[PDB]
Design a binder for this molecule. Structure first.
Ligand SMILES: [Cl-]
Ligand SMILES: [Cl-]
Ligand code: NA
Ligand code: NA
Ligand code: NA
Length: 322
């Protein structure tokens, strides 16, 4: 019997010494097994494998705890999905574009590029150590592990079409937003008013208008007493807000927003671009960069800086002048 020593892991930090029989596959001994993303389940150990680290699934109590502590998931397919994605994302390129880590287009990944660019411009701290560690590396230019984690957390495979709003939602669900608070009021014709308080992810996301200013002034909505009704922002406490809507032609004005995403083309037949407001408006499209003084396009998501906002207008005034 010929053997080699290898290490198994679920978090690539805590290692577990193993002695493997070179006459059996990794799968026969460990279950599903990966070497830096590559599936070696059906491969028998090589001499060159000695001392190397292999990912396995969290198939015993120790690994189950290590994987939960690192990733904050007990989804049994998570490690396989992460490794499957990493085998691709490690071959992607991550150019620095206008000082930010982007992603060269591959595998329908434009939604990931604009999400990654956005993260580098808003204040957001991740909760799972896995995302903390990988995002730090991404900021330094080595974003393969971070991108593979995004795929795994969002349950998207490489090549699958993704939505930026949904992707940000998943990332925010794995981020510390406990201090974020939103208070809204709805004026329902002359039938009454209703205030609502939102926290965390729900305090920083809105679907229906791209304009933060319009949300402060008021948006028209239905209520039980008709379509003469107005919803507006009373109070906001957060370091950013994200305003989203179905793609529509929209003008982005320098200095009035932080960054945005555009979706050109048709449904499930299109492409995302990133627009960032710096000294001028830069459009980052993967590895590509252009500039303009004004930008108009089919915008889907706009990000704004915030700290603390409180309205200085009474309900009836928003209802009648928004
Ligand atoms: Cl972080
Ligand atoms: Cl989390
Ligand atoms: Na950030
Ligand atoms: Na950086
Ligand atoms: Na959270």
């Amino acid at each position: 019997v010929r053997t080699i020593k290898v290490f198994t892991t679920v978090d690539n930090i805590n290692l577990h010494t193993q002695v493997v029989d070179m006459s059996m596959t990794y799968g026969q001994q460990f279950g599903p097994t990966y070497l830096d993303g590559a599936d070696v389940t059906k491969i028998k150990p090589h001499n060159s494998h000695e001392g190397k680290t292999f990912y396995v699934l969290p198939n015993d109590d120790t690994l189950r705890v290590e994987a939960f502590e690192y990733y904050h998931t007990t989804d049994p397919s998570f490690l396989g999905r992460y490794m499957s994605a990493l085998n691709h994302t490690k071959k992607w390129k991550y150019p620095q574009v206008n000082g930010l880590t982007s992603i060269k287009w591959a595998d329908n990944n434009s939604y990931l590029a604009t999400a990654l660019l956005t993260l580098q411009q808003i204040e957001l701290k991740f909760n799972p150590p896995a995302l903390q560690d990988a995002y730090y590396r991404a900021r330094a230019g080595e974003a393969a592990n971070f991108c593979a984690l995004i795929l795994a957390y969002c349950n998207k495979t490489v090549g699958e079409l993704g939505d930026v709003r949904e992707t940000m939602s998943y990332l925010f669900q794995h981020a510390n937003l406990d201090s974020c608070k939103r208070v809204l009021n709805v004026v329902c014709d002359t039938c009454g008013q209703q205030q609502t308080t939102l926290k965390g992810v729900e305090a920083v996301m809105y679907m229906g208008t791209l304009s933060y200013e319009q949300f402060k002034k008021g948006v028209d909505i239905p209520c039980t007493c008709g379509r003469r009704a107005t919803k507006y922002l009373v109070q906001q406490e957060s370091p950013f807000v994200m305003m989203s809507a179905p793609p529509a032609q929209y003008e982005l004005k320098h200095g009035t927003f932080t960054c945005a995403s555009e979706y050109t083309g048709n449904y499930q037949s299109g492409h995302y671009k990133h627009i960032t407001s710096k000294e001028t408006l830069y459009c980052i499209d993967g590895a590509l960069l252009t500039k303009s003084s004004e930008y108009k396009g089919p915008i889907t998501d706009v990000f704004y800086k915030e700290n603390s906002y409180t309205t200085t207008i009474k309900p009836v005034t928003h209802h009648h002048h928004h």
